[PDB]
Coordinates of N, CA and C and ligand atoms in Angstrom, one line a residue:
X1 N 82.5 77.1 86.8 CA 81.4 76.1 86.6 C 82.0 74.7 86.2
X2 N 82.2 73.8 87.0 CA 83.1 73.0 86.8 C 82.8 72.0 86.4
X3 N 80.9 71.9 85.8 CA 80.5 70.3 85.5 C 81.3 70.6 83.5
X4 N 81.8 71.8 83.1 CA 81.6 72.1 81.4 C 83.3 71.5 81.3
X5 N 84.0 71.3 82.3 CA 85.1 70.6 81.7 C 85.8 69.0 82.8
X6 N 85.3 69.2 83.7 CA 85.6 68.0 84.6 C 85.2 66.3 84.3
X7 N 85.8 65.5 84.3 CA 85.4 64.3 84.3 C 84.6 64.1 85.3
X8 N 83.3 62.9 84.8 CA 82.8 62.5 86.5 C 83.3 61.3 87.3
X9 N 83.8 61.3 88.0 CA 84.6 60.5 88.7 C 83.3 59.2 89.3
X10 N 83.6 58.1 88.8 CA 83.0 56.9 89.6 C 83.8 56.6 91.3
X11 N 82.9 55.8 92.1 CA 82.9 55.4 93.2 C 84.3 55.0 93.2
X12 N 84.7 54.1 92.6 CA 85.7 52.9 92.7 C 86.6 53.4 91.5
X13 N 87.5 52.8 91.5 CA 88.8 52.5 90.1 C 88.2 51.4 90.3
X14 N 88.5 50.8 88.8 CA 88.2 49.7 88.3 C 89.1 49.0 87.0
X15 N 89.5 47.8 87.0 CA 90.1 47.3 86.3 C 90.1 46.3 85.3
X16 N 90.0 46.7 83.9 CA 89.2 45.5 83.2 C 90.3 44.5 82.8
X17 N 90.5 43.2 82.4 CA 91.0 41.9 82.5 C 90.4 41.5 81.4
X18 N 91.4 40.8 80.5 CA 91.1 39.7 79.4 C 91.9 38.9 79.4
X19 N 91.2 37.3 79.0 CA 92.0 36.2 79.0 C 92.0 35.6 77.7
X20 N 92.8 35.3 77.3 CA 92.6 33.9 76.1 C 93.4 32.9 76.5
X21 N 92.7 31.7 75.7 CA 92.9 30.4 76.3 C 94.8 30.3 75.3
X22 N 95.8 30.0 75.2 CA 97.2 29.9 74.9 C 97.3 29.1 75.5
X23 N 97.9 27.7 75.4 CA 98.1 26.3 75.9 C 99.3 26.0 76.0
X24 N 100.1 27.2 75.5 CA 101.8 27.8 75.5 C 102.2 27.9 77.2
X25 N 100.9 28.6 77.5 CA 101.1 29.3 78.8 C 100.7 29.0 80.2
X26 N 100.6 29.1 81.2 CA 99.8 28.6 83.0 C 98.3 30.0 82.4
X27 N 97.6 29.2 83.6 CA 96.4 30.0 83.0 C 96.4 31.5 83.8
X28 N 97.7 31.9 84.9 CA 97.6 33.1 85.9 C 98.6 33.8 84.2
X29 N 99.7 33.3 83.7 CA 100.1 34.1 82.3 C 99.4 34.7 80.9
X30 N 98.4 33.5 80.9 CA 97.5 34.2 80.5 C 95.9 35.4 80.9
X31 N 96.2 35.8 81.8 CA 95.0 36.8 82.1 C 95.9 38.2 82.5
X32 N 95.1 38.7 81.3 CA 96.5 40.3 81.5 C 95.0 41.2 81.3
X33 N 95.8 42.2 81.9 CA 95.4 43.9 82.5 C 95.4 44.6 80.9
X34 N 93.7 44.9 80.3 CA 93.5 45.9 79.6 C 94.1 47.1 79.9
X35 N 93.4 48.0 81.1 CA 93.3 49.0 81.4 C 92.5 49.2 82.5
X36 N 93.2 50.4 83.5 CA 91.9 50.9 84.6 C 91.3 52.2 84.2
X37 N 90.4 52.4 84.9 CA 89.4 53.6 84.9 C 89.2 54.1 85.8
X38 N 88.7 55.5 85.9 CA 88.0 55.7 87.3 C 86.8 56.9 87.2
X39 N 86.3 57.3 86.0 CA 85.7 58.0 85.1 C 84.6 57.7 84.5
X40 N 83.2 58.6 84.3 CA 82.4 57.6 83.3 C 83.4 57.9 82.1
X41 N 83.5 59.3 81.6 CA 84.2 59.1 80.0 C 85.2 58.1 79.9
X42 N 85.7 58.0 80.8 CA 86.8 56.8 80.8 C 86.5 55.9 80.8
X43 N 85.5 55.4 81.3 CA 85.1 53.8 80.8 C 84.5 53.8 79.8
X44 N 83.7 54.9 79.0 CA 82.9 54.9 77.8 C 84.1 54.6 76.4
X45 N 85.0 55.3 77.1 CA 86.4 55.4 75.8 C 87.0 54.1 75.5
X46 N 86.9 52.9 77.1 CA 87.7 52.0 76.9 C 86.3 50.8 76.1
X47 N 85.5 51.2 76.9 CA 84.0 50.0 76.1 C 84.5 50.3 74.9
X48 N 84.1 51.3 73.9 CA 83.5 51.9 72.5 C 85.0 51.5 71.9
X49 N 86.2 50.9 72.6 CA 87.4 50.7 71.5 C 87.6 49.3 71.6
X50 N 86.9 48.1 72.4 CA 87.1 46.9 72.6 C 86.2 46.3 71.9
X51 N 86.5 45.0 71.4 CA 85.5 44.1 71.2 C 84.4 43.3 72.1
X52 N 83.1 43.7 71.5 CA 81.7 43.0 72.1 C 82.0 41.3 72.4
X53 N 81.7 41.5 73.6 CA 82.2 40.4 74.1 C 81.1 38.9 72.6
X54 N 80.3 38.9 72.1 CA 79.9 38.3 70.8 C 80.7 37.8 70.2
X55 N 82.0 38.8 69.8 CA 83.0 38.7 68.6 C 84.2 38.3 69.0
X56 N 83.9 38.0 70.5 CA 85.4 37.4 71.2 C 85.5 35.4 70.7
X57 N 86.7 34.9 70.1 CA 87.1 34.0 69.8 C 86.4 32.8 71.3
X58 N 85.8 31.7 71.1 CA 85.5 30.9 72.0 C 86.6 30.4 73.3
X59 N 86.4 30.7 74.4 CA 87.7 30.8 75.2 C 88.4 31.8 75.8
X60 N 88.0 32.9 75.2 CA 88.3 33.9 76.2 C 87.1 34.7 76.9
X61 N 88.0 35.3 77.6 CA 86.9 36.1 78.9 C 87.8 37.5 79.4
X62 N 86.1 38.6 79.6 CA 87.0 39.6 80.1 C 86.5 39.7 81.5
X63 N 87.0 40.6 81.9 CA 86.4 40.8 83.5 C 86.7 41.9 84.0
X64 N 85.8 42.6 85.1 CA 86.2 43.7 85.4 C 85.8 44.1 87.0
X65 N 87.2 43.8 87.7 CA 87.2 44.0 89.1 C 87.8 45.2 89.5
X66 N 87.5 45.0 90.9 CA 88.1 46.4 91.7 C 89.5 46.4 91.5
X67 N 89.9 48.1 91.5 CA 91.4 48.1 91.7 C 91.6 47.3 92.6
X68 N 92.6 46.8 92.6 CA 93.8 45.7 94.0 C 93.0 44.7 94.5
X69 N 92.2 44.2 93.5 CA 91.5 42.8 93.5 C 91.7 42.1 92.4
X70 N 92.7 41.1 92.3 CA 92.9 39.9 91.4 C 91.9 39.2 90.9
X71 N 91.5 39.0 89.6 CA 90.4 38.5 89.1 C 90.7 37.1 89.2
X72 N 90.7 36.2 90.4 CA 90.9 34.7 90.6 C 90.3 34.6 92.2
X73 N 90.1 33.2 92.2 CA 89.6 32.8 93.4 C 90.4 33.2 94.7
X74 N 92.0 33.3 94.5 CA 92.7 32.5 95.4 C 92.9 34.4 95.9
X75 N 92.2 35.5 95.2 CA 92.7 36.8 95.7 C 91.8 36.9 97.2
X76 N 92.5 37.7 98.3 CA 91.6 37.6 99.6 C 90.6 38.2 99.1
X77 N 90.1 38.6 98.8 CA 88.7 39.5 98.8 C 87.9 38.8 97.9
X78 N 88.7 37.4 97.3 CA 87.5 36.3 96.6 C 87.8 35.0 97.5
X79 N 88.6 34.8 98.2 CA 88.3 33.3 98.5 C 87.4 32.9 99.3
X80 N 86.7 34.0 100.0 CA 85.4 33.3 101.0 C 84.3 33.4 100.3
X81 N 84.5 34.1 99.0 CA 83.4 34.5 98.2 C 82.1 33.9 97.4
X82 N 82.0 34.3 96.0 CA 81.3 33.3 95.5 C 80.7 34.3 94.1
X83 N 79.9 33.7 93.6 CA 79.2 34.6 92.1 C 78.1 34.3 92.1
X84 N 76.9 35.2 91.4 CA 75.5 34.7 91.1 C 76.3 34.3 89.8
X85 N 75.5 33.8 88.9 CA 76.1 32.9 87.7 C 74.8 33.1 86.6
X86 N 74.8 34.1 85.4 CA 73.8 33.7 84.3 C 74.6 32.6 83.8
X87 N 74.0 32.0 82.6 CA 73.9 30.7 82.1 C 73.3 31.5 80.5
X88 N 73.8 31.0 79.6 CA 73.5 31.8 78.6 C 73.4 30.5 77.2
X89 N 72.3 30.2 76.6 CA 72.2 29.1 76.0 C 73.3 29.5 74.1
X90 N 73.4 28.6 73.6 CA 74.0 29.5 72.4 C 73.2 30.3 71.6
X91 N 72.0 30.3 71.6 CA 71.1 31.7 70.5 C 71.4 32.8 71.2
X92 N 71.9 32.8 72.8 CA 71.7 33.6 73.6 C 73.3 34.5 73.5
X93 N 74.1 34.2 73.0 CA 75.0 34.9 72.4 C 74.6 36.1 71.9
X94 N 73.6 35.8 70.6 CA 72.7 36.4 69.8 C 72.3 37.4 70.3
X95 N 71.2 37.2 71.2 CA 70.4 38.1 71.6 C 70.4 38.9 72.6
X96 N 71.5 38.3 73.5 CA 71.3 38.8 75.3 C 72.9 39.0 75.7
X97 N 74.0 38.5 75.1 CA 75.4 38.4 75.8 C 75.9 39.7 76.0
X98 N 75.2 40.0 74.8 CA 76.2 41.9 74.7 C 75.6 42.7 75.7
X99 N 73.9 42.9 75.5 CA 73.6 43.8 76.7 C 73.3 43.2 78.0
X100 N 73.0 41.7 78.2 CA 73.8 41.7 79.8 C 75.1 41.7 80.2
X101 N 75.6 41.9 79.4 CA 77.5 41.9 80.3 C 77.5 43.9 79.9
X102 N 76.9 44.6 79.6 CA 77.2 45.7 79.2 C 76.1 46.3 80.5
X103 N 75.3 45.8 81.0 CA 74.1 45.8 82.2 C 74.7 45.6 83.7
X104 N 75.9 44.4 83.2 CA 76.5 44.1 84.6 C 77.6 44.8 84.8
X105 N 78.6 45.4 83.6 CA 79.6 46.7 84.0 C 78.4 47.7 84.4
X106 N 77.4 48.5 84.0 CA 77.2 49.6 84.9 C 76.7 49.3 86.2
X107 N 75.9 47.9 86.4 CA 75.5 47.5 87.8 C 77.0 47.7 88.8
X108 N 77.8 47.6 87.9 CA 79.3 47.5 88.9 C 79.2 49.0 89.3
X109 N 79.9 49.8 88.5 CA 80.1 50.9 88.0 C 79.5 51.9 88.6
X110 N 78.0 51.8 88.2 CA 76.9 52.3 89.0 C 76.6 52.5 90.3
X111 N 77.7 51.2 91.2 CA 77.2 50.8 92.4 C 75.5 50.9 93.1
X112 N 75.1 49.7 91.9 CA 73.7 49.9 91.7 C 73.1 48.9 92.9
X113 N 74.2 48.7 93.9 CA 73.5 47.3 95.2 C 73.5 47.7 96.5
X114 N 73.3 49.2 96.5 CA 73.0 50.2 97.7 C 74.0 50.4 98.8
X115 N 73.7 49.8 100.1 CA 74.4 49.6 100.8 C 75.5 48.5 100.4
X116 N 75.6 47.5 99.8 CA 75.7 46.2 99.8 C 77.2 46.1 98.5
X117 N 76.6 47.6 97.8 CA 78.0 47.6 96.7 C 79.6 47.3 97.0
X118 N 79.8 47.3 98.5 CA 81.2 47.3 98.7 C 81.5 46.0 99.1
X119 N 80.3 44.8 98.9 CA 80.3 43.3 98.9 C 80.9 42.8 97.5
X120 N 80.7 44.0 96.3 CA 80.6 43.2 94.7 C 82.4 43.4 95.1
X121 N 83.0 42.5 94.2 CA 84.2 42.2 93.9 C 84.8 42.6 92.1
X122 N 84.0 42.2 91.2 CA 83.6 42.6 90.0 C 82.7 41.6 89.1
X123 N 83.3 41.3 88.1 CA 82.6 40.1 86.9 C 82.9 39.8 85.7
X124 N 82.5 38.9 85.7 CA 83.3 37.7 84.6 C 82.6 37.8 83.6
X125 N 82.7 37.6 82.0 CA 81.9 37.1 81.3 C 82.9 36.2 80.4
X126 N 82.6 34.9 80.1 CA 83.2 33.6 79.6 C 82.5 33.0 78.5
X127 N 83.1 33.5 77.1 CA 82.5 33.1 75.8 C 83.0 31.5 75.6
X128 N 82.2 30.5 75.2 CA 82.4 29.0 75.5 C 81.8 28.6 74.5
X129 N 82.3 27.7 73.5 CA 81.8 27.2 72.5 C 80.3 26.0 72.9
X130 N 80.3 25.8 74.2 CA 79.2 25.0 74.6 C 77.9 25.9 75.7
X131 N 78.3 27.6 75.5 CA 77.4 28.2 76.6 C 78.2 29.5 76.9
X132 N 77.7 30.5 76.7 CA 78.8 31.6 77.5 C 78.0 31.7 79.1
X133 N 78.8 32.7 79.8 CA 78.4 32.8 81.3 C 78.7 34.1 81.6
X134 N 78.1 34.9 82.3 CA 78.2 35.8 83.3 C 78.0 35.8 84.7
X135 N 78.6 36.2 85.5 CA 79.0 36.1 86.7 C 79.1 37.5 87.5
X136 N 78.5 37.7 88.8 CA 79.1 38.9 89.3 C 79.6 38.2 91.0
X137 N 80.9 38.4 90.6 CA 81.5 38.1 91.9 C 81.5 38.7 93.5
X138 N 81.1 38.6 94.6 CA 81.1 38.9 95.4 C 82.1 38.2 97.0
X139 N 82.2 39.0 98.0 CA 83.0 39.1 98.7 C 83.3 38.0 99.8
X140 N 81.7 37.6 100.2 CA 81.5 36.6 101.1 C 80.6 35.8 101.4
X141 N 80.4 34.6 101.1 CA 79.6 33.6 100.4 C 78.4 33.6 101.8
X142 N 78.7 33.6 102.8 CA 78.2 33.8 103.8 C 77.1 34.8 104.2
X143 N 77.3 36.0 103.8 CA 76.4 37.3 104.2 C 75.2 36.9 103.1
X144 N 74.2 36.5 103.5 CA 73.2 36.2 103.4 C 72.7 37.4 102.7
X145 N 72.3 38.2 103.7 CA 71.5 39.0 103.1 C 72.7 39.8 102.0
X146 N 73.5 40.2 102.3 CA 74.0 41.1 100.9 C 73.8 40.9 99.7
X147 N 74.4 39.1 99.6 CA 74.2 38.5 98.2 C 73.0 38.4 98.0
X148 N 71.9 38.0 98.7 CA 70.5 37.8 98.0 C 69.9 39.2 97.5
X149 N 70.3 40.2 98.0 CA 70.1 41.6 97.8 C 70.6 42.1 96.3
X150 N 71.5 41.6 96.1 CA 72.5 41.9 95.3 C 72.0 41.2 94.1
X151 N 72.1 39.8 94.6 CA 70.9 38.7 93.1 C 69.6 39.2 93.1
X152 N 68.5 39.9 93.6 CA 67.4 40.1 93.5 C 67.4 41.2 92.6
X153 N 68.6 42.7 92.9 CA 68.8 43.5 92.0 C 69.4 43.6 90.7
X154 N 70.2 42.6 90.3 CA 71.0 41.8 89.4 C 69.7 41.1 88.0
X155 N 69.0 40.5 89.5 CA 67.8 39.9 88.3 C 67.5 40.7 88.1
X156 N 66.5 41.6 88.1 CA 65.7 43.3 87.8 C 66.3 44.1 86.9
X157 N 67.5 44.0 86.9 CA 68.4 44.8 86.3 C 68.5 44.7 85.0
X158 N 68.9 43.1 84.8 CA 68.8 42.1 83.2 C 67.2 41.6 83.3
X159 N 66.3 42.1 83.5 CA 65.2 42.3 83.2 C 64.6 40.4 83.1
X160 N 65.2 39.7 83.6 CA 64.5 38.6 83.7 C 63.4 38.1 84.5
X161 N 62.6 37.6 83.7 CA 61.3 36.9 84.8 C 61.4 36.1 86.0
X162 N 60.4 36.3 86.2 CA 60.1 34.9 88.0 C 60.5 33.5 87.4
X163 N 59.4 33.6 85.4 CA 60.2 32.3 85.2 C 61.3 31.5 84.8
X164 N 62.5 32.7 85.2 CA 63.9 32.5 85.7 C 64.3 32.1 86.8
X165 N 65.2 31.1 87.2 CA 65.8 31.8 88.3 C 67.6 31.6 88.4
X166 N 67.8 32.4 89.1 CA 69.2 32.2 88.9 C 70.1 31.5 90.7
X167 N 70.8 31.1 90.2 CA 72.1 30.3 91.2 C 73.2 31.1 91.9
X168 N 73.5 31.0 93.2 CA 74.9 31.2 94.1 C 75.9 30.8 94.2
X169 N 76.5 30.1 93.7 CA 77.7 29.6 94.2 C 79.2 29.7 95.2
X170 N 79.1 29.3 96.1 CA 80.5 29.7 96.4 C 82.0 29.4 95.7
X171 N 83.1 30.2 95.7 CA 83.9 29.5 94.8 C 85.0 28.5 95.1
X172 N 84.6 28.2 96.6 CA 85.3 27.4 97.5 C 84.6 25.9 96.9
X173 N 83.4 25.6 96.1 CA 82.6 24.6 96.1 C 82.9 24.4 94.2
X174 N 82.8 26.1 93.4 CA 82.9 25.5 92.0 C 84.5 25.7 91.7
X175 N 85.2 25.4 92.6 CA 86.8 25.2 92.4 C 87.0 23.1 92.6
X176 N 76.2 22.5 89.0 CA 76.1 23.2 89.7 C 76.0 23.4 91.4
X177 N 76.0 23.8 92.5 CA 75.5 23.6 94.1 C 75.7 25.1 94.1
X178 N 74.1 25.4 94.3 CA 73.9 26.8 94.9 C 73.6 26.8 96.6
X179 N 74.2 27.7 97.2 CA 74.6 28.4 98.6 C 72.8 29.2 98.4
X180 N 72.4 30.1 97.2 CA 71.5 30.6 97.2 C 70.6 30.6 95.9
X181 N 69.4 30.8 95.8 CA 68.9 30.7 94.3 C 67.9 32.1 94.9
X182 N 67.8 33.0 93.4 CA 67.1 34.2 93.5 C 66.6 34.2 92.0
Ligands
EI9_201 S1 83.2 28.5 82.4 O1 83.9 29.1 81.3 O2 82.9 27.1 82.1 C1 84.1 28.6 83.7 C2 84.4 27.5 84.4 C3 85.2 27.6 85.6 C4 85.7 28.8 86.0 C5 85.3 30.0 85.3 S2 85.8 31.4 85.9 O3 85.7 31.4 87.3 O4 85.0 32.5 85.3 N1 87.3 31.7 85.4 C6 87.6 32.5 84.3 C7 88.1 33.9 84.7 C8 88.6 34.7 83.7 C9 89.0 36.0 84.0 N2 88.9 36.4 85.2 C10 88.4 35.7 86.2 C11 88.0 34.4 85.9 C12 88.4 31.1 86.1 C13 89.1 30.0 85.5 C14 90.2 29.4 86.1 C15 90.6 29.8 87.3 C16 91.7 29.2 88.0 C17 92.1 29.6 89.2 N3 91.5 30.6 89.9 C18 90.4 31.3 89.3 O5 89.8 32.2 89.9 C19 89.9 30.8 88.0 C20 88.8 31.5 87.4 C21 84.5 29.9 84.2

């Protein structure tokens, strides 16, 4: 009976990423490799030992992309790409930072965007003394329907209202002008 000792294996390996800002350093020396996974217990083990993205110092960011996908613009599987983009005011640290970026690893994770999951690339969250941000990166700024698919279930997901809306960007353009709004 093999569910009483086996790991459950996720879709994808995955790779989580943290940066801090060091002014010592280029900003590709600063962004190093936590750890990958490919497991739910294995991502539950690497979440429950890191710090809430809340308690992260202003200036860093983690992120968590596919195996053999570079968390930067210039990786092929991001440069035609682009991100929906939350926007997170400062009380919103407070109240919303932790369980939407904890909402958007399992949207990853989950491969919670149907057909359309093998468009997500991974996602960003950027703690900022003037606003943090979450981001889920995708593959190609262009497929219309994927990403609107993708941001309509994204919104639902983080449980925000109609009287939200959120922004597309490509990263060819934020290297705000949204490509799409959902
Ligand atoms: S936000 O903090 O104001 C902000 C502004 C600009 C860019 C970004 S970013 O795209 O999220 N970004 C941070 C990051 C961290 C870890 N993993 C991926 C992305 C970022 C910053 C600088 C870059 C330079 C070159 N190529 C990139 O893809 C970059 C991404 C957040």
């Amino acid at each position: 009976n093999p569910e009483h000792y086996i790991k459950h294996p996720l879709q994808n390996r995955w790779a989580l990423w943290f940066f801090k800002n060091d002014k010592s350093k280029t900003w590709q020396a600063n962004l190093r490799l936590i750890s990958k996974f490919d497991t739910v217990e294995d991502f539950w083990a690497l979440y429950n030992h890191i710090q809430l993205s809340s308690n992260l110092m202003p200036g860093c960011d983690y992120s968590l992309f596919k195996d053999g996908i570079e968390p930067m613009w210039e990786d092929e599987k991001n440069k035609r790409g682009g991100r929906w983009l939350i926007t997170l005011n400062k009380q919103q640290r407070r109240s919303d930072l932790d369980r939407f970026w904890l909402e958007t690893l399992l949207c990853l994770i989950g491969e919670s965007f149907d057909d359309y999951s093998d468009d997500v690339c991974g996602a960003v969250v950027n703690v900022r003394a003037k606003g943090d941000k979450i981001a889920i990166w995708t593959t190609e700024c262009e497929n219309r329907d994927a990403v609107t698919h993708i941001g309509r279930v994204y919104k639902e997901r983080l449980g925000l209202p109609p009287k939200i809306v959120i922004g597309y960007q490509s990263h060819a353009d934020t290297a705000t002008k949204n490509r799409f709004v959902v």
